[PDB]
Amino acid sequence: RKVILYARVSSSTQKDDLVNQVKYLEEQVKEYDQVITDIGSGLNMKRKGFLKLLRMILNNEVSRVVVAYPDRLVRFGFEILEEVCKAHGCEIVVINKEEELVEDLVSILVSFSGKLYGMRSHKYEKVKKCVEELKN
Amino acid sequence: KRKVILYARVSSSTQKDDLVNQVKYLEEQVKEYDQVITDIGSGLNMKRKGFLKLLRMILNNEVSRVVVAYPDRLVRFGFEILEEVCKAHGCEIVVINQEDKEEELVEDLVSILVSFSGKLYGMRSHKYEKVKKCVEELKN
User: Fold this and answer.
1) Strands B35-40 vs B92-95: parallel, antiparallel or unpaired
2) What angle, 0 to 180 degrees and rounded to 10, lies between the N-to-C axes of helices A78-86 and B49-58?
């Protein structure tokens, strides 16, 4: 089984941020098999590293996953993961922005916004004002 | 052996009669099912007892299939995690209506907006003010 360090940053503009997150995970843990990283949101369910990991846990390749701090793994659904790891011989370890929340918030509105334009809902107008302000 | 589950949820105690209907609807759609699981609470609740039990079962190799009326019923977010989770455990998610229903979607945004607002305030974020606005805006 394996010990995996999982690190993520929101933006490719944060690539510098990501390595430091890796060094930090590396300094805290000196017996780790594998490193996994992604650039993107914890919303993105297509994230390559994250997927390879999720299957690795399911494949039982993983004893432990270490996250530099919370919500590195996903934005929503940690409960599901906790369960998935809890029945897969797996411990989830956490050592410890607004913008990342805020950005994550905007996307959700936009994502919900497609559905609202699809329903021709009167609410679509309200979501659009909300978002533009949020980016304001 | 292999269990086929009918999983049903409605958001509120107000839709309780409708849940009974959601159950009867699923039963009409699938001739053969083992068990019926229902929850009351929003699809954003990761602590729905019915949900965790089902999920817990899937992790134990007891489910051939889970059937729900909308994907909505299972979760707002991370339905994909469940899918990857399922593929691991010999289970299939069958969805009898491939859609999001409107009133349910709106309710879901409002909660998320409510949560994000607290976190923002909690950190004294520069932006919180506007979020509270979107909510009042959204309730109508």
Assistant:
1) unpaired
2) 40
Judge whether A38 and A47 are in contact, CB under 8 Å: yes
Q: Which tokens go with A9?
A: 């940053």
Q: What is the resolution of this structure in A?
A: 2.3
Cβ contact, residue pair B76, A76, below 8 Å: yes
Cα(A4)–Cα(A90) distance, integer angstroms: 11
DSSP 3-state of A39 = strand
Query: At CA A111, angle to CA B91 and CA B139, rounded to 5?
Result: 105
For CATH 1.10.287.2170, list the domain ranges present in chain B: 99-140
State the fold for domain A1-96.
Answer: Rossmann fold (3.40.50)
Q: Which residues of A touch B (CB under 8 A)?
A: 43, 45, 51, 54-55, 58-59, 74-81, 83-84, 87-88, 98, 101-102, 105, 108-109, 112, 115-116, 119, 121, 123, 126-127, 129-130, 133-134, 136
Question: In B, which residues are within 8 Å of A45 by CB distance?
Answer: 78, 80-81
Distance from C-alpha of A94 to C-alpha of A45, rounded to nearest angstrom? 21
> Is CATH 3.40.50.360 the right assignment for the domain spanning A97-136?
no
**Structure solved using which method?**
X-ray
Does domain B99-140 match CATH 1.25.40.10? no
According to the CATH classification, is domain B1-98 in 3.40.50.1390? Answer: yes
